[PDB]
Design a protein around this ligand. Structure first.
Ligand SMILES: [Co+2]
Length: 257
């Protein structure tokens, strides 16, 4: 099936998913010298106080921390968005080396990892309907660099041993995603896609300018996860990132001067 390996990686995905060569694919390189400030934009509103995390799952590609999205508990509004977008899950993309791992790049810079907080537009009723719409999803992307530890990440790191292999899950209640955010909510935004198959062009991307720092120990534990299932030869879960795709007929807008 699709993956990040030697014979099924991003360069092959177009055979099964021809939209991989589409007009609004993600990620992209963010050129800070061509993105333009848009005074029409508003501040982001991140309302995560009532978030209800449920479970963490190794899906064979990354791990998802899943939320109750059956009410407006953890929502994203404002910015470029019209309406209300509910948090369904977050996950990360990361490298085998600290010099790669992010999906978006900034002036061609790769970060060590990238956090995706995935939200769907409540006007479409559920996630599966939302991904069929151009304005179905809002993904808040946050870069990770290696430096100091991120205290709010540690609960995630310490459950990883329990979900080492594909298809394992564990209870993951009472996790506060606010502990993953940087100080600033300044952002870039553009229209794009899911970065994994089916690569649907349903995402308003909101990529924060300020990275968070995680420690070398935290990243090393991410790199101990496995793509494989239990009882199969070990394939470390690293380098689960798609490279930058052509911008084509899009503009990246900044919320900040
Ligand atoms: Co992602």
């Amino acid at each position: 099936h699709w993956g990040y390996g030697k014979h099924n990686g991003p360069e092959h995905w177009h055979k099964d998913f021809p939209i991989a060569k589409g007009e609004r694919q993600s990620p992209v390189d963010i050129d800070t010298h061509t993105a333009k400030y848009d005074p029409s934009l508003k501040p982001l509103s991140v309302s995560y106080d009532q978030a209800t995390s449920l479970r963490i799952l190794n899906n064979g590609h990354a791990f998802n921390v899943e939320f109750d999205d059956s009410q407006d508990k953890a929502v994203l509004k404002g910015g470029p968005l019209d309406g209300t977008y509910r948090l369904i899950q977050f996950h990360f993309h990361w490298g085998s080396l600290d010099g790669q791992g992010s999906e978006h790049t900034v002036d061609k810079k790769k970060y060590a990892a990238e956090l995706h907080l995935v939200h769907w537009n409540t006007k479409y009723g559920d996630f599966g309907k939302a991904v069929q719409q151009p304005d179905g999803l809002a993904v808040l992307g946050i870069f990770l660099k290696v430096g100091s530890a991120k205290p709010g990440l540690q609960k995630v790191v310490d459950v990883l041993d329990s979900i080492k292999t594909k298809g394992k899950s564990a209870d993951f209640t009472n996790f506060d995603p606010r502990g993953l955010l940087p100080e600033s909510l300044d952002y870039w935004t553009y229209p794009g896609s899911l970065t994994t198959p089916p690569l649907l062009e349903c995402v308003t991307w909101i990529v924060l300018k300020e990275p968070i720092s995680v420690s070398s120990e935290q990243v090393l534990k991410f790199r101990k996860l496995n793509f494989n299932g239990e009882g199969e030869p070990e394939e470390l879960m690293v380098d689960n990132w798609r490279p930058a795709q052509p911008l084509k007929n899009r503009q990246i807008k900044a919320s900040f001067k």
